[PDB]
A and B are shown apart, each in its own frame.
Chain A
Amino acid sequence: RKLRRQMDIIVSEVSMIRDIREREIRIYTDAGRICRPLLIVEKQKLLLKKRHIDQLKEREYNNYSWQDLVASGVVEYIDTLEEETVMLAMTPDDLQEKEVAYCSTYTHCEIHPSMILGVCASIIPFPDHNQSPRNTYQSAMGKQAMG
């Protein structure tokens, strides 16, 4: 992981999975796996600091891209195998503050929950207030609207 948070040898797409219950560790480098980027939570703290946002707002000037943030060891791509062995925080404003603690052992944090939706389900205003069949039917209709 330390090499993947730095892109020394292992590409960012490659995934390591440590099966802990049964003593296995599998590294997948196949072409066809489906992953998605997630934040990295070291301490219940996010690694996406304020300086990253400051350098990221001023794009086209600092040439600070998304790939620079991947190289900074802040975000990384997690595939479906690795999601079975990750503790994923939904939002940081709720799941890193001390409370009657749920787990307090988070490894990754979701960037934003709205990114779980597709391209046609993203044009729906307040899709969580609807019923799911209605969202599906709107996803069908939205590829059919004149424009």
Chain B
Amino acid sequence: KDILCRLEHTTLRKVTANTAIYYDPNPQSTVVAEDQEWVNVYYEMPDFDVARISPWLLRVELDRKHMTDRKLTMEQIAEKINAGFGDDLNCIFNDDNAEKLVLRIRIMNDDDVFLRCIESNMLTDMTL
């Protein structure tokens, strides 16, 4: 099964449950009812300004079933996204506290639909 997962072409689309984009200009007061933001709250990763200044974000929720079957973790997906997108993107994942597997993606510093374009370009050919 491990070799089977290491051979099959697994995109982000086959693993994601649903996705959406939001406008959350204050990560401290995230509008999407999560306190895992403690990371950003105490993160010294560039706060905003030229960084998380992008208020719009990509909130994508994974399912537990395909993450279990493909033998994947949140950190591996985040690392693949970071490697494929450089430092233009910021990814914050979710620990194994609930079944809701959350990836929040922000633009690091065309305007707003570019996030949707890279959402399509990330569902298509990430090659996890």
Tell me, yes or no, whether A and B come into direct contact in the complex with CB atoms closer than 8 A: no
